Amino acid sequence: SAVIGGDNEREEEDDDIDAVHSFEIANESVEVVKKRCQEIDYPVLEEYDFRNDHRNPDLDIDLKPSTQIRPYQEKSLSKMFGNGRARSGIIVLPCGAGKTLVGITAACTIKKSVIVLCTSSVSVMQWRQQFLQWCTLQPENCAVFTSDNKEMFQTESGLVVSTYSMVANTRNRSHDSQKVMDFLTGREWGFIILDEVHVVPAAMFRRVVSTIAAHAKLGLTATLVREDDKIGDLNFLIGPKLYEA
DNA sequence: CCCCACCCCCTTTAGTACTTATGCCTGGTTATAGATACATTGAAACCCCTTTTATAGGCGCCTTTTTTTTTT
């Protein structure tokens, strides 16, 4: 019959298509970590029919802010555009560079429910303000999902902003990872933005990505490489540096 | 040479107690406006001056006379 997919606890069950992913011996079903949901894009451009039981995106309005981009910023964005993950991957730029502008552009371009993963709450507030262009921070179009408050909303530069996570009963999206597709989490959001992606390689934080169906992934950072060389894992989950300056 | 254990770090956020400024309201005396004590210069309002010719009471005030009381 028609192809179908569904999300189960940070994994994607698959039916009617052997080609798309990998088969599970234990239970005859194609199963994959949530991160490899993107192969579904194969059906998209193709306009191949499938049923998407897996993704539960928060409803997202088609954003149309106007974001001006200097030339280098456009170049990086375009590199990112090629795969929006393999090509998006991570963008490395100096602090002055205006990576956030690129992020904003991707969010506008993508216009899907988005999750931003940041280290601190302050950065979260900062991002939240920028998100205002799509709809002001006061606007519903922006939300914050953390221990303090849990709001699950759509698109923006990232409609949802959350932190990497901490250790506690309640924490950031890492804790939440099964619950809602983010850079961190399960099946709510299509785009995952990692501000300061270098943090992501933490053994725990990395799960945020794996557990995520979110096809598009962007990591922003001044310095990609880690002393630990943990940075290597990013390519699979997030992507490798498609652009650097 | 490899594996396991111990030591040192930074991560940022949540708690209630303690200190400082703002608003609160509250007890003197000082600064304002007008009238009072009153005192001012101004004026009007007042009685005052010239006399007569007759009538006939009451009015007050004078010096000389008579009576009473005191002292020797």
Would you say the C-beta of A119 is within 7 Å of strand B?
yes
Query: How long, in residues, is chain A?
Result: 245
| Residue found under tokens 């996570």 | A165
Question: What's the one-letter identity of residue A147?
Answer: S
C1' of B54 to CA of A64 (Å): 139
| Residue found under tokens 């490798």 | A240
Question: What's the one-letter identity of residue A78?
Answer: S
CA–CA separation, A71 vs A204, rounded Å? 36
Strand A143-144 and strand A23-24: pairing?
unpaired
Cβ atoms of A167 and A194 within 8 Å: the answer is no
Q: Which nucleotides of B are covered by protein (CB under 7 A)?
A: 12-14
Cβ atoms of A48 and A34 within 8 Å: the answer is no
What's the per-residue H, E or C state across A78-125?
HHHHCCCCCCCEEEECCHHHCHHHHHHHHHHHHCCCEEEEECCHHHHH
CA–CA separation, A23 vs A157, rounded Å? 36
Per DSSP, A183 falls in state S
CA–CA separation, A169 vs A180, rounded Å? 17
Annotated binding residue A190: no
Annotated binding residue A216: no
Residue A109: burial class (beta carbons within 10 Å; 0-12, 13-18, 19+): middle
C1' of B2 to CA of A169 (Å): 38
CA–CA separation, A6 vs A156, rounded Å? 25
Which residue from A174, A39, A190, A32 is spatially nearest to A109, judged by alpha carbons? A190
Chain A residues 46-85 with Cβ under 7 Å of strand B are: none
C1' of B23 to CA of A36 (Å): 63
| Residue found under tokens 């963008």 | A91
CA–CA separation, A142 vs A137, rounded Å? 5
Cβ atoms of A199 and A221 within 8 Å: the answer is no
Q: In what order do the strands lie in the sheet with A114-118?
A: A143-144, A160-163, A114-118, A191-195, A216-221, A89-92, A241-244
Per DSSP, A150 falls in state B
CA–CA separation, A163 vs A169, rounded Å? 15
In DSSP notation, A151-181 reads ----TTTTSEEEES--SSSS-SHHHHTTTS-
Cα torsion angle, A124, A104, A79, A46, sign? positive
Per DSSP, A184 falls in state S
C1' of B52 to CA of A121 (Å): 133
Q: What was the structure determination method?
A: cryo-EM
Would you say the C-beta of A170 is within 7 Å of strand B?
no
